[PDB]
């Protein structure tokens, strides 16, 4: 699949960057390819839990 790290996260939206260079943004419920749809966004920790169990987390080389 395409693995996505986040570039910005605030209460509500979160701006995500994938490995293809594509930039997107998500909310409490939004369809994300492969990862399902977002279950919740935690801006304080910088996590997003999705339906597929996949956790979206600030890129290892930028967090």
């Amino acid at each position: 699949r395409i693995i996505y790290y986040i570039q910005a996260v605030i209460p509500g939206r979160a701006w995500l960057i994938g490995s293809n260079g594509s930039t997107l943004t998500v909310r409490e419920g939004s369809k994300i390819p492969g990862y399902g749809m977002v279950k919740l966004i935690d801006s304080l920790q910088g996590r997003i839990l999705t339906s597929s169990g996949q956790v979206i987390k600030f890129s290892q080389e930028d967090s």
Binding site: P11, E28, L40, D42, S43, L44, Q45
Partner: peptide, 9 residues
């Protein structure tokens, strides 16, 4: 809808 900073364990 949920503001996590208003969070409590």
């Amino acid at each position: 809808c949920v503001s996590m900073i208003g969070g409590s364990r």
